[PDB]
Symmetry: C4
Subunit: 335 residues, 4 copies
Amino acid sequence: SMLPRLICINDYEQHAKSVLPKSIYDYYRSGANDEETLADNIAAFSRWKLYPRMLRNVAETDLSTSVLGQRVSMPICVGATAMQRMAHVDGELATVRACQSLGTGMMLSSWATSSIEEVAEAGPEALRWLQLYIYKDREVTKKLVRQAEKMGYKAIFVTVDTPYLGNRLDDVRNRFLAAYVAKAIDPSISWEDIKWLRRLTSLPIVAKGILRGDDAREAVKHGLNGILVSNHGARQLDGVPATIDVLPEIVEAVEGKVEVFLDGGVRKGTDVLKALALGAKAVFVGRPIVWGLAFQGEKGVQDVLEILKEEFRLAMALSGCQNVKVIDKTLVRKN
Amino acid sequence: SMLPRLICINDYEQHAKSVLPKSIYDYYRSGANDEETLADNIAAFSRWKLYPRMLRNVAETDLSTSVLGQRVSMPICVGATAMQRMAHVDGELATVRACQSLGTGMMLSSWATSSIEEVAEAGPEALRWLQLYIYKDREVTKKLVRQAEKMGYKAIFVTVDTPYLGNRLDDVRNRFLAAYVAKAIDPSISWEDIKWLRRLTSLPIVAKGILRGDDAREAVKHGLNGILVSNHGARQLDGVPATIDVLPEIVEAVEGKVEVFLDGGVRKGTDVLKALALGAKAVFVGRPIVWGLAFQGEKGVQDVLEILKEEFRLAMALSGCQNVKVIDKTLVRKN
Amino acid sequence: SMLPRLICINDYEQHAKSVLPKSIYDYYRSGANDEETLADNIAAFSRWKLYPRMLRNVAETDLSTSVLGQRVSMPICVGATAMQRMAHVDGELATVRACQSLGTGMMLSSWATSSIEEVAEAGPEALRWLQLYIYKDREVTKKLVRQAEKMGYKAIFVTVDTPYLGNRLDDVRNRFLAAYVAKAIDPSISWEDIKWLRRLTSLPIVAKGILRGDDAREAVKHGLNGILVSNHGARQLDGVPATIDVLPEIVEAVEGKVEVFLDGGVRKGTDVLKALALGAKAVFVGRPIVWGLAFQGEKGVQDVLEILKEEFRLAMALSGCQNVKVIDKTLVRKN
Amino acid sequence: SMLPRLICINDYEQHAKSVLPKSIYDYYRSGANDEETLADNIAAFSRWKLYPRMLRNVAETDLSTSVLGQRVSMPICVGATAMQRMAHVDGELATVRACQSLGTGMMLSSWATSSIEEVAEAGPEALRWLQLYIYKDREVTKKLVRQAEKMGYKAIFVTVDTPYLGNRLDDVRNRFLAAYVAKAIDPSISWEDIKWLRRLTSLPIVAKGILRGDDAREAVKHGLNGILVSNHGARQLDGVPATIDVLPEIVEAVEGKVEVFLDGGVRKGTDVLKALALGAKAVFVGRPIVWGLAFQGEKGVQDVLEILKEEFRLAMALSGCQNVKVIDKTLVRKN
Ligand SMILES: Cc1cc2nc3c(=O)[nH]c(=O)nc-3n(C[C@H](O)[C@H](O)[C@H](O)COP(=O)(O)O)c2cc1C
Ligand SMILES: Cc1cc2nc3c(=O)[nH]c(=O)nc-3n(C[C@H](O)[C@H](O)[C@H](O)COP(=O)(O)O)c2cc1C
Ligand SMILES: Cc1cc2nc3c(=O)[nH]c(=O)nc-3n(C[C@H](O)[C@H](O)[C@H](O)COP(=O)(O)O)c2cc1C
Ligand SMILES: Cc1cc2nc3c(=O)[nH]c(=O)nc-3n(C[C@H](O)[C@H](O)[C@H](O)COP(=O)(O)O)c2cc1C
Ligand SMILES: CCCCCCCCCCCCSc1[nH]nnc1C(=O)O
Ligand SMILES: CCCCCCCCCCCCSc1[nH]nnc1C(=O)O
Ligand SMILES: CCCCCCCCCCCCSc1[nH]nnc1C(=O)O
Ligand SMILES: CCCCCCCCCCCCSc1[nH]nnc1C(=O)O
């Protein structure tokens, strides 16, 4: 295969560090402040131990599932990551092409270096969603939703954990965004604006960035269709729990009323299994996709997605699960 | 800005290590004995995880609060640190000037390299308090209180955790204070002397150095106006808990009868948020102020205070808090 | 003695790393994926603390016990490890000869580089068992059992945790087995095939690879004679618990109906004591045997087994135990 | 003072490593096997946190206490360490002279490089006890007790955790004792031999090496006068708990019927405070005494003892304790 030989997600990061300008690599890697939550997003997955069932017959595995009523090849989807064209010339076009190939969904950043329309045209058969920021300018906010609707996108992920940008130390050091966001994004965002957004579109809406059970229930009350349990990849408020650690309480709080997803520190097939065992319908990957792009554009993303798929297929088979329906809560226990 | 580029409190320490004579840097940095509590003052903050509320509207933040009935710009104040003129020529004059600029309070060491009067004259509009040791000589002890009263200081912080000085290994190695304190400070100090001090002055009095809930309640009983939960920056008895870990029990013990403050290991805006979520009215910083002074005197202190302010403003906004009144206990949970 | 001087199991590994080609050493050492469980198999033993009884009279120790009704010199036996002829020319013949000398049992891999018959002929007086994989080809599966029966083997250990091979990163890097196993081993294996196997042979059957209490009880229900609590030396599903940590729950689940064994991270006499105190009849060693072989073939295996025996004899005597019958559960408590 | 400048117990060890032949340093330093308990004897003290009382009046401290009815200057005494003449020419004579100077007790090894009589003559006013092994030869065992009685020793510490010597890896590597002990010490030792010993002498008898509450109570039943909670400095059975962690359960089990002491990992004044807060009458130091000897014979031991005394005096004063009677259990809580 392609050289150098990369066989797990960490290899992709290690490769990306070797080829990317420091300030770009740093921008992608960084967490907020002392990066306590960034270390924890990963370490937390390790604390959840797996309890595999044997002798279940795993000759045939079917990794397919559904996200907000749309079928996907696997419970592993591409999360929004700004400015993908810094990692590769093809940026978000490469990403959507790979998602089309794999049969999974792509969440498009509002801060994409490719337009809603262009992404639809590169991947017309891909499952596509828009990640939306509520800008101070509600007119452009509305325009984005309408372009998403018109261009055949299938949900809006409204990010609710970024009234201001987090403080990522390397970005400041590298004189690299916090000021631009403060100029553009509306920090006044409340549940009122979520009601506005719910009236504006009939598309499925997911609140991205929920970490509390009470906010989750509030999301349900406002007719939202899903919760993405996210600490924004540990890039916003540092010292928040790992997403894997809060997921079960969010899942409990929501009472099956709404689909619950996770992102933050997914690197391996076992991370995927553990999230699903805890009640997540699907997970999203942020950084691994950028590492994929940095390695080989479309094929790199495809590689990263296929590593995650097959790692997940194996962990599923080793744990006695033929498909996602048979993943249950007795599969996991925290140490 | 000023070079080298320092953007968080740790940078200031790293700079101070590079420019200060070893024995001075060491004197400032050191904890007691094996520095177990010194590591814990910091590590403990990391264990307390934040549970941010989303969609609260944080377009306007007001960090102002009040300490012992006096208004301050932020719940972040300067704690007493002896011999500031070793870090910078302007020492405590630079410090009070910065506190005046920021609108926060300065706690003046009894072991200041500037007099009560001089500090009042450098920062006549600054909120100023005296940190008092009860010397064997009660006449000078009384003189200090009377000078503080006459010079427009607004409280006495009586330090109660230093009957003798702790054993800081580097100070001994560097042949650098323990003997001088044993000659000067009265180890016979009991609750009787606190009753004396309470009769001596009508100024607000805070017991600094309380780590036990029973002592806290005893402080309330003696008509004291506040508790500063402090292990003296881990420089007295090593192996005492981190201040953040004992705060909630002190807060509980006191039953809202008296204001409770914290110092010890505050380095970040999130440390400030976490202390307030646990019931502290305000925090004090010791070392970061000395690092500030070592970098650029007044402006350095101002920089350190402004880093803490804005870090705190951000952590507040990211956690859904517009002001300090809405900080509550559901914001935190220990891991 | 023989040089270099090796006096504990870790020395043997350190020696084997120095003399074996990297890809062979790596093949032997590796765990699955990030090797979380591989670190835990060992670290977990360290968390279980010993509570030795004094003054019991340990002048005479008898380490003998019985496995599936057959007497052994010690509760320490050789687990199946594929392709031993990579470590030494004599491979499995050297291993069985050493087991014969020591009076303990050898578990023979289905993937041995020596035949069932040859191993019987090298060690005709050795206690010998067959580790069986259920191949897609049930005819060869049956042939192996029949050769084991005919050649005087005394049990079948059916491995139930390998429907597919785990992903061992170094093997992939070194272009070293996963594909060959997927071609050969039947992933469709269920409890039905265990019923088949139970009808096929009157030999004692042990399910190897059980990690769950419910599977353990299911094993009992199917007339199996033992459980080998195993995570396949952390080489299958990564993130499963250490075997020492799940043993007590398996032991409880089984209600003394069946003998329970452990493998995974046994390196020391105290590991052996701790497993027995938790309810294991006997332990199996995988890697230490390969390290032994790499050092000096038969004598190396003999050395490793004798280190384990005597380490175990000492830990037994120091803990007040004259024989295995007096090992009890009050001997251990987890920290 | 004397050079190099050593100001805490760790400095003494660091000095001893620099001047002692490796095999001698190693012999002294080593724990058993992987030295898990050796690390834990120390780390465990760190987990017990101190809760100092303020404002108690600590102008006068009295560190004096009593051990088995005999007064000592401090609750810090010298434990038995074999072959002290390897660290210094004066060996046990230097040690007893220092104990005489300080007014504390010396526990003399049965494996001393100085005789019972000679030690009595070097330190005729020192508080002296004999550490006794029950040799296979009961005639010499009895002779030692009778010489101790005749020479004015005031207790027998019978070591009950060494039926065989532990396996200390460096000793084996360095070809350095296990065989000699197996030839000399009786592994058949039971409670019967303790009854024998109790009939043999009217001297106070302490069982040294108890780690279990049931053995402790058995010790009480046999008319023993004290328990020394000891894991033999982590040199016997590895993986036993730290002595500080089991002390409170031993203390509880004994119901104040008998005095309870601790050794194992005492390096600091706070270690002493923490042991007493948990119920120990006194602690014993092993290794620090050998480090003292290696530095400067008698004066070195004196220095180490005085460091421990004054460290303890300070920790006592900082925690609000004027004497040992006022040390209580609310002073400590495990983290
Ligand atoms: C380089 C980068 C850029 C990101 N840009 C966005 C964005 O534009 N919009 C958004 O909602 N989240 C953004 N996020 C957060 C991700 O959507 C997601 O929550 C996070 O990457 C998932 O964690 P993981 O990277 O550890 O997979 C970004 C994250 C990274 C790492
Ligand atoms: C260099 C230094 C000097 C100090 N001098 C005093 C003092 O004179 N009086 C006093 O009450 N506390 C003194 N303290 C303790 C501080 O008031 C405070 O409790 C501690 O610095 C806060 O912890 P932090 O440094 O980790 O912020 C000193 C602390 C340091 C680090
Ligand atoms: C190099 C190696 C080869 C192995 N081959 C087999 C095998 O052929 N069949 C099997 O059931 N288990 C196999 N195992 C797993 C072992 O039977 C056993 O569960 C594991 O080695 C015990 O753990 P330890 O190595 O840490 O002792 C193998 C393990 C290793 C390390
Ligand atoms: C070098 C050395 C020699 C020892 N020799 C004896 C001995 O002869 N008899 C005995 O009962 N204990 C012996 N011990 C154990 C000590 O009495 C004691 O339990 C241990 O040293 C205390 O732990 P610490 O060294 O960490 O202080 C020895 C310990 C060491 C470190
Ligand atoms: C091709 C024209 C450029 C399109 C506009 C892109 C501007 C993006 C600058 C603002 C920085 C966003 S960084 C961000 N937003 N949300 N999450 C993140 C993150 O870095 O985690
Ligand atoms: C300008 C004339 C000098 C004024 C007197 C200063 C003497 C200070 C020497 C005593 C050392 C105090 S160090 C201290 N006190 N309290 N806390 C500390 C600390 O180092 O934490
Ligand atoms: C002498 C002729 C060769 C006999 C057939 C040996 C083929 C073995 C190749 C398959 C790789 C097995 S590796 C394995 N199986 N079970 N556990 C393991 C392991 O590596 O843990
Ligand atoms: C001057 C003549 C020599 C007197 C006899 C000394 C012999 C000692 C050799 C046996 C080794 C004892 S080491 C030991 N015993 N108990 N605890 C220990 C230890 O090393 O912890």
